[PDB]
Symmetry: D2
Subunit: 130 residues, 4 copies
């Protein structure tokens, strides 16, 4: 399961998206240490603040199943460049993923930006601050 | 899969909860029309606003898998009476579940309150308002 | 400051709304015991989950100023019937307002629904449950 | 109104915080181009996902008043190093503040980190992506 294959997983996950308000579908694929893949997609609500992102869906899914050790996260959306995770998602990612997990950001045109969880949100607010 | 059995599913789901900040674990079990069960649990974050509830986790899981027709939702937590879904969750539930889906609320001491999605949040803000 | 006058405050507050994504402006006016009025409006974000509602904006404003005793809350939006506070807002309201606070819901066509904070979200999840 | 004076505003704002769950008070002070200051503080909820941050409170306050041109944002909390805005707040900030706005991060022990909105969340998901 290389990053290209994980990207294909995220591209498939994207098609499950429930985004009738923004019409902006996002897909995510989370790869665990053991090689299992969890797909995620954004799920919206008439009350916008309740919308849930693809990255979060995938992580919530994995964690709820007892899978907490990840190696890579791919995210895909039809954006100009590699899709940029929103601040809230970066926060969830920084909490649920170890700092060296690889985050693969892409769009639907082959643009690829790869970074670590740490780079995704440097000095991210964390439990240590509490 | 009667409500007692769905409650047991939610009680098991509750044990997967990641709630180190509130130390308040919540479990949810979503039953689809075809009889499949999706378990959910709350997942917290050092940045409190990012916490995700059990009900949402279960629904996000189901919807991301393509399951969108539900018949019952059980929610369990160690509260004095049947656990009360927070407003945000009631909003997500009112969006992702049809009005006649049965919501079974319970705690860890047999208290049971049963209501419909409609009763859970009467006149809930919806897409029609937009 | 009767409810009709508070409604006019909410209507004015609505015009301050920053909602370029939904194009759905909401206004809120919070009346304190001492008779001071705090206006609120929804403020959106490209990342939908970050959108903030009018009711919340007004309450956050009042509380941040040290005002914590309220008597009435008016909410207005261009909806078919009286605007229905989203679940998240009902949750914030149930926390920051006493159960006796009057919530006046209206649209831009004179439809008015009045209820208490308790009635807005009966049995709302609260600190006592934690 | 230099940054030291804005920091003192944030420190005062912090004392208005309503954070009975985390017991973690945060303060924010937003300086407009015209030199007006808006104070913000975090306001929590029994339902954690409903918690609102100091930075957001200040910005919501300013925007609701019609003030939309800012020059500096100070944030203070009792953290080990300069307080780190959570991802959600960085997202709100990247939307409501121009990329040149100066963000002053500090704690209660004189540690100060200064950066631009762009640096706070480089390549932040934005409307252009939608
Ligand atoms: O973090 C990324 C960027 C934001 N989107 C979302 C949620 C929402 O349904 C839509 C518009 O914000 O894209 C994601 O799903 N993931
Ligand atoms: O709607 C219900 C009530 C709220 N809790 C949550 C989220 C959070 O981790 C914790 C404290 O609010 O309980 C749920 O998980 N479900
Ligand atoms: O609770 C009510 C219903 C929801 N709206 C919002 C936030 C968002 O900008 C827009 C669409 O959900 O209306 C409010 O401002 N208040
Ligand atoms: O972005 C920063 C970091 C997070 N805190 C918050 C909200 C919440 O009440 C508390 C714990 O997350 O700190 C802020 O107020 N601002
Ligand atoms: Zn996101
Ligand atoms: Zn909830
Ligand atoms: Zn709302
Ligand atoms: Zn924050």
């Amino acid at each position: 399961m290389n990053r290209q294959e994980l990207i294909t997983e995220a591209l498939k996950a994207r098609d499950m998206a429930y985004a009738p308000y923004s019409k902006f579908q996002v897909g995510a694929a989370l790869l665990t240490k053991d090689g299992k893949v969890y797909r995620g997609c954004n799920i919206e609500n008439a009350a916008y603040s309740m919308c849930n992102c693809a990255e979060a869906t995938a992580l919530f899914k994995a964690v709820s199943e007892g899978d907490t050790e990840f190696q890579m996260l791919a995210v895909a959306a039809d954006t100009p460049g590699p899709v940029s995770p929103c601040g809230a998602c970066r926060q969830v990612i920084s909490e649920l993923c170890t700092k060296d997990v690889i985050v693969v950001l892409t769009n639907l045109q082959g643009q690829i930006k790869e970074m670590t969880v740490e780079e995704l949100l440097p000095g991210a607010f964390s439990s240590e601050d509490l």
